[PDB]
Amino acid sequence: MNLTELKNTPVSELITLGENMGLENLARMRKQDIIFAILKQHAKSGEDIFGDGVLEILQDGFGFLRSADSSYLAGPDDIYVSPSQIRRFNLRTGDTISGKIRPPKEGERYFALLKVNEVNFDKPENARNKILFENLTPLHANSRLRMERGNGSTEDLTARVLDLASPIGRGQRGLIVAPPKAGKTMLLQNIAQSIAYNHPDCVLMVLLIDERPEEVTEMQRLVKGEVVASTFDEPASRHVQVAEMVIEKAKRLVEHKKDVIILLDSITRLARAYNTVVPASGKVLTGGVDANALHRPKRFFGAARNVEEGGSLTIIATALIDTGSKMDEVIYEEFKGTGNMELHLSRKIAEKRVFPAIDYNRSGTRKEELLTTQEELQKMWILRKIIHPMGEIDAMEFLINKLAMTKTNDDFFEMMK
Amino acid sequence: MNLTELKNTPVSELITLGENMGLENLARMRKQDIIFAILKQHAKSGEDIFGDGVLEILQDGFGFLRSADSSYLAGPDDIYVSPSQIRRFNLRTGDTISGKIRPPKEGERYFALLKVNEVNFDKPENARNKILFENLTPLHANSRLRMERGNGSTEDLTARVLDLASPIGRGQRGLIVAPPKAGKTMLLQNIAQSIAYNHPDCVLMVLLIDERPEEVTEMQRLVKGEVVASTFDEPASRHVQVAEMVIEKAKRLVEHKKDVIILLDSITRLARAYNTVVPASGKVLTGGVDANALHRPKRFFGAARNVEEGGSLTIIATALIDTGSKMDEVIYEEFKGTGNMELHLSRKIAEKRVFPAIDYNRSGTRKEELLTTQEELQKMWILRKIIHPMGEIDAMEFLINKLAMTKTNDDFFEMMK
Amino acid sequence: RWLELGLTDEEKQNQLEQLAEQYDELKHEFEKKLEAKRRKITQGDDLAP
Numbered sequence: 001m002n003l004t005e006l007k008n009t010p011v012s013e014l015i016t017l018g019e020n021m022g023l024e025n026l027a028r029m030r031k032q033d034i035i036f037a038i039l040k041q042h043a044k045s046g047e048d049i050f051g052d053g054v055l056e057i058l059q060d061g062f063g064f065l066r067s068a069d070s071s072y073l074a075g076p077d078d079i080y081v082s083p084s085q086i087r088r089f090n091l092r093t094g095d096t097i098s099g100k101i102r103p104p105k106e107g108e109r110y111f112a113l114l115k116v117n118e119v120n121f122d123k124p125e126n127a128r129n130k131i132l133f134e135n136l137t138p139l140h141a142n143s144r145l146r147m148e149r150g151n152g153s154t155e156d157l158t159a160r161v162l163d164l165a166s167p168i169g170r171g172q173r174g175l176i177v178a179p180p181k182a183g184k185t186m187l188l189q190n191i192a193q194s195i196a197y198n199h200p201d202c203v204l205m206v207l208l209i210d211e212r213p214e215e216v217t218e219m220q221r222l223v224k225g226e227v228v229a230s231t232f233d234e235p236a237s238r239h240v241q242v243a244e245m246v247i248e249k250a251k252r253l254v255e256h257k258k259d260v261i262i263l264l265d266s267i268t269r270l271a272r273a274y275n276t277v278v279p280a281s282g283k284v285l286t287g288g289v290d291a292n293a294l295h296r297p298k299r300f301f302g303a304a305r306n307v308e309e310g311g312s313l314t315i316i317a318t319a320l321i322d323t324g325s326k327m328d329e330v331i332y333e334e335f336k337g338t339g340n341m342e343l344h345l346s347r348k349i350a351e352k353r354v355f356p357a358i359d360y361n362r363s364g365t366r367k368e369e370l371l372t373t374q375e376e377l378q379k380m381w382i383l384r385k386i387i388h389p390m391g392e393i394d395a396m397e398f399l400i401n402k403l404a405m406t407k408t409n410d411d412f413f414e415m416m417k
Numbered sequence: 418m419n420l421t422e423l424k425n426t427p428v429s430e431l432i433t434l435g436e437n438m439g440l441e442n443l444a445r446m447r448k449q450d451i452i453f454a455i456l457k458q459h460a461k462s463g464e465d466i467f468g469d470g471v472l473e474i475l476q477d478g479f480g481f482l483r484s485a486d487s488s489y490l491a492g493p494d495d496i497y498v499s500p501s502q503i504r505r506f507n508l509r510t511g512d513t514i515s516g517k518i519r520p521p522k523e524g525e526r527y528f529a530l531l532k533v534n535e536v537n538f539d540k541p542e543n544a545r546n547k548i549l550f551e552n553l554t555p556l557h558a559n560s561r562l563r564m565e566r567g568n569g570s571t572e573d574l575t576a577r578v579l580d581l582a583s584p585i586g587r588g589q590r591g592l593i594v595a596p597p598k599a600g601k602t603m604l605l606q607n608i609a610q611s612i613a614y615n616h617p618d619c620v621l622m623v624l625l626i627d628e629r630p631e632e633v634t635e636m637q638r639l640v641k642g643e644v645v646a647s648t649f650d651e652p653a654s655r656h657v658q659v660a661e662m663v664i665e666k667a668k669r670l671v672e673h674k675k676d677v678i679i680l681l682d683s684i685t686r687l688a689r690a691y692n693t694v695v696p697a698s699g700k701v702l703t704g705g706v707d708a709n710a711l712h713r714p715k716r717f718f719g720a721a722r723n724v725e726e727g728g729s730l731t732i733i734a735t736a737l738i739d740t741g742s743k744m745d746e747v748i749y750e751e752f753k754g755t756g757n758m759e760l761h762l763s764r765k766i767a768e769k770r771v772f773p774a775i776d777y778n779r780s781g782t783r784k785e786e787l788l789t790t791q792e793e794l795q796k797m798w799i800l801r802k803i804i805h806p807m808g809e810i811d812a813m814e815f816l817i818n819k820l821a822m823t824k825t826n827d828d829f830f831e832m833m834k
Numbered sequence: 835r836w837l838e839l840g841l842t843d844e845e846k847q848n849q850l851e852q853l854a855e856q857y858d859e860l861k862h863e864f865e866k867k868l869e870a871k872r873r874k875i876t877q878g879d880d881l882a883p
């Protein structure tokens with residue numbers, strides 16, 4: 001059997017599968033316990049297992065292959081691999097590996113890998129000959145990620161407006177500055193849908209950190225691809241674990257010449273987590289925040305770059321402002337100008353209950369002539385000059401009406417001429 | 418072999434060199450690990466090594482010779498030297514040393530220097546007879562650093578305008594007061610290009626502190642000489658380390674009668690770093706900033722001076738204003754009048770999207786009759802009197818048109834007569 | 835304490851450099867020996883669980 005076919009099925013499927021396997025009443029155990037029992041029952045007939053897991057190493061030396069069911073945490077379904085395999089096949093954290101595995105043998109309690117088959121969807125030949133991430137040379141984005149769907153429905157506005165507000169490129173360092181309860185959830189839903197429709201080749205990744213389970217399930221059933229999430233049912237340990245797991249997975253992918261686009265929300269919660277786990281170095285500043293505790297979020301935002309020969313790693317992270325927490329204030333202050341793309345959402349326009357609510361004059365992209373063509377850039381300049389003198393609510397209503405009479409951006413362009 | 422020839426080559430060159438050396442698959446290790454392995458393989462054939470590194474001392478007594486690949490940080494390529502050599506050859510921090518080195522011997526793990534060859538590009542004779550930095554006598558600049566290229570291309574404006582806005586002299590204490598996203602990056606790119614074209618004798622130095630890797634690589638491939646950088650992938654420790662390294666390197670150079678011109682960006686990030694590392698002395702003022710924590714930036718801005726017998730140390734540092742951080746405000750306040758050259762950039766003109774955006778009435782140089790000649794000074798007076806009554810956007814457009822019909826400054830001068 | 839001298843490069847510099855290299859190598863080897871002895875005598879020994 002394969003593990004992924006036990007992965008993609010819901011709990012009732014596992015129930016009926018165990019009933020087929022002639023097992024005891026299994027409605028009481030975790031899904032992973034059911035998968036473990038079913039795999040043991042299947043291998044008792046003299047069968048081998050096929051598994052797939054993202055690799056993680058501790059200082060203990062040996063490695064663990066986690067699945068996305070528990071958002072890459074320890075469990076009875078994860079595979080244990082010896083340091084010998086890591087030394088031989090040149091394995092490292094984040095390297096997703098798929099291949100033959102066996103149930104735990106006499107005295108064992110977790111699965112063990114037999115033969116590697118796909119290292120990050122690649123043969124071990126070129127997987128061992130992998131270019132290092134930090135040894136690469138960053139660049140800037142010329143490949144323009146078109147956010148327009150072209151269907152022109154009622155919500156597609158929030159996407160097409162970005163086509164004139166904040167251009168998106170491969171490997172862009174983007175950050176959202178927004179107050180709570182403004183519309184960021186549906187915004188990232190829209191961006192994920194749009195990038196999946198216009199660019200289905202790039203592997204989609206969404207970061208749900210310190211969120212509610214309803215949002216978790218709503219986003220795991222609406223994104224057009226594999227997703228990861230993390231609620232607050234566990235302390236900051238799970239949060240930092242999933243952050244490292246996803247960052248090393250993206251690093252290994254972009255080292256394998258992949259196009260990764262991570263959507264993080266929200267980054268202030270990741271900062272709070274990294275603060276809570278990291279011990280105090282004896283110096284604290286205003287806000288009850290340690291000095292070098294923000295080093296991990298810094299790094300996570302610095303991982304975004306553009307590879308020269310091929311591949312990119314775009315990171316679009318949302319930040320929370322206007323929450324009243326001065327701590328959060330300082331956090332945003334640390335994130336003043338670290339990214340080259342700013343998406344500013346204001347509560348003042350969202351209180352007028354029109355969506356989206358774009359701060360055109362406050363948002364923008366640095367060095368944007370390298371992303372789009374010349375005529376599109378000139379029309380962007382014209383639109384910026386037209387929108388600068390007016391305010392924000394009137395400007396938003398103007399843009400909404402102009403993009404409501406028209407569907408594609410060329411119509412609005414020629415109408416602005 | 419020489420270490421610098423392993424320095425200037427990219428990663429693929431090291432890959433093919435290791436393949437020539439019959440080495441294991443080395444695509445997984447750092448560039449410095451590859452250099453270490455290649456040097457070990459080369460010395461296994463009975464060969465000596467030639468290295469070059471900037472020297473740094475801790476309280477431990479012994480010294481470390483760092484390279485510019487890691488922007489002067491610890492690594493497997495840095496050379497370890499005993500305190501005996503520092504006592505004998507009168508070594509100190511910032512003193513770049515080149516000479517014979519050997520791979521680590523039995524029980525060792527870093528390289529060791531055998532015989533010094535070039536102490537700051539000088540024989541040890543006059544290197545031991547070095548005048549002390551603080552024991553020197555500061556002066557003012559008469560040697561005018563002409564910023565005009567003479568080619569008169571589309572961007573050369575931003576340089577030639579300084580020839581009438583802010584004169585540049587050797588050892589000038591210059592500071593830029595500018596809001597984010599205004600055009601400082603290309604501004605310093607222009608200034609570096611212009612000083613390298615007009616004055617290739619003076620060693621160029623650019624400080625990239627707390628920046629993004631894309632800017633790092635864009636500036637390391639556009640400056641006409643060796644450059645140093647530092648991103649936010651490490652905490653303020655790396656920032657303060659590179660600040661001390663570069664300041665001692667410049668001090669040793671100007672003690673060796675060199676002309677150093679450092680370009681720092683941005684200085685507010687250096688202040689934040691020095692605040693984060695230095696523990697609280699029990700007294701804090703408004704802005705969450707310690708009182709004597711700014712002592713290190715102060716010193717760094719005070720290192721600029723003009724040597725009497727020969728050599729100079731010019732420092733041109735950029736500061737960030739209009740960021741909303743009151744902390745930053747206070748920082749700029751501490752930097753109100755510490756420098757004798759002010760370059761004021763305003764977001765109001767940059768929002769009209771014309772470049773450059775000079776605050777002529779707010780920018781200037783103190784004691785400028787000692788820099789240029791008499792007729793040039795009189796024409797500067799005439800231009801200042803003509804530009805004072807008018808505003809800033811109209812004045813900028815006027816200057817742009819006047820320097821657009823003409824190429825060299827003499828044409829604009831005679832046209833203003 | 836003032837081994838530093840120099841004149842008539844062609845052979846004197848070579849011989850003085852060789853002898854200074856021998857001296858510093860001997861000093862470093864003896865320092866390594868002393869550090870190894872210190873780490874050996876300061877290493878705590880296991881007694882019982």
Ligand SMILES: Nc1ncnc2c1ncn2[C@@H]1O[C@H](COP(=O)(O)OP(=O)(O)O)[C@@H](O)[C@H]1O
Nearest residue numbers: 155158179180181182183184185186187355356
């Ligand atoms: N494009 C849109 N069309 C209609 N309603 C919207 C749109 N965008 C946001 N809203 C409204 O705004 C609210 C946003 O809720 P929520 O997801 O909690 O915001 P946030 O993403 O800031 O947490 C929703 O209740 C929804 O009714």
Ligand SMILES: Nc1ncnc2c1ncn2[C@@H]1O[C@H](COP(=O)(O)OP(=O)(O)O)[C@@H](O)[C@H]1O
Nearest residue numbers: 366367368575597598599600601602603772773
């Ligand atoms: N003199 C100039 N000539 C051409 N383009 C310019 C000039 N000055 C600024 N720009 C444009 O303005 C943008 C400046 O953004 P950036 O340099 O990131 O902000 P900052 O000025 O704060 O560094 C660049 O995309 C650049 O193309």
Ligand code: BEF
Nearest residue numbers: 179180181182185
């Ligand atoms: F998703 Be809400 F802005 F907390």
Ligand code: BEF
Nearest residue numbers: 337596597598599
């Ligand atoms: F480079 Be900008 F001033 F953030």
Ligand SMILES: [Mg+2]
Nearest residue numbers: 183184185186
């Ligand atoms: Mg939301």
Ligand SMILES: [Mg+2]
Nearest residue numbers: 598600601602
């Ligand atoms: Mg800049």
